[PDB]
């Protein structure tokens, strides 16, 4: 087919691989930041459930 | 932290009922029928404001 086919295919491959490398580095940074200070979706460690707390009036008023 | 604010003995002074438990239980039902409104107000303030110092009156 000629040299331009291989040339532009190589350009497309290089663009894909460079984008993948940048995405992997960004993913590493995102994971590190979330694990250090969990405020995104990931690394959300559990917490006791709020809905299982009694709020009805009880025997002792000092609650 | 901050110090705790609690009232003095003059604020806690009242004419206590020097009445035994058998006497109270004998007069229990009529005391619960006649003095009901003040008692229910005190229980409402105690169960709303958990602090006992807000209900001395």
From Swiss-Prot, chain A:
Top-level taxonomic group: Eukaryota
Compartments reported by the entry: Mitochondrion inner membrane
Disulfide bond entries: none
Subunit structure of this chain's protein: Complex I is composed of 45 different subunits.
Family: Belongs to the complex I NDUFB5 subunit family.
Role: Accessory subunit of the mitochondrial membrane respiratory chain NADH dehydrogenase (Complex I), that is believed not to be involved in catalysis. Complex I functions in the transfer of electrons from NADH to the respiratory chain. The immediate electron acceptor for the enzyme is believed to be ubiquinone.
Protein name per Swiss-Prot or TrEMBL: NADH dehydrogenase [ubiquinone] 1 beta subcomplex subunit 5, mitochondrial
Organism: Mus musculus
This protein's encoding gene: Ndufb5
From Swiss-Prot, chain B:
Intervals of motif Cx9C motif 1: 35-45
Disulfide feature: 45-55
Domain CHCH positions: 32-57
Localization per record: Mitochondrion inner membrane; Mitochondrion intermembrane space; Mitochondrion
Family: Belongs to the complex I NDUFA8 subunit family.
Chain's role: Accessory subunit of the mitochondrial membrane respiratory chain NADH dehydrogenase (Complex I), that is believed not to be involved in catalysis. Complex I functions in the transfer of electrons from NADH to the respiratory chain. The immediate electron acceptor for the enzyme is believed to be ubiquinone.
UniProt remark on domains: Contains four C-X9-C motifs that are predicted to form a helix-coil-helix structure, permitting the formation of intramolecular disulfide bonds.
Oligomer and partners: Complex I is composed of 45 different subunits.
Name listed for the protein in its UniProt record: NADH dehydrogenase [ubiquinone] 1 alpha subcomplex subunit 8
Species per Swiss-Prot/TrEMBL record: Mus musculus (Mouse)
Gene from which this protein is expressed: Ndufa8
Interval of the full protein contained in this chain: 2 to 58 of 172
């Amino acid at each position: 087919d000629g040299p331009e086919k291989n040339y532009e295919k190589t350009l497309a491959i290089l663009q894909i691989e460079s984008e993948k490398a940048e995405l992997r580095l960004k993913e590493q940074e995102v994971r590190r930041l979330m694990r250090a200070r969990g405020d995104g979706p990931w690394y959300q460690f559990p917490t006791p459930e709020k809905e299982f707390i009694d709020h009805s009036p009880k025997a002792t008023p000092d609650n | 932290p901050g110090i705790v604010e609690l009232p003095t003995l003059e604020e806690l002074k009242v004419e206590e009922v020097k009445v035994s438990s058998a006497v109270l239980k004998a007069a229990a039902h009529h005391y619960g029928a006649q003095c009901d409104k003040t008692n229910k107000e005190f229980m409402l303030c105690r169960w709303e404001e958990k602090d006992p110092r807000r209900c001395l009156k």
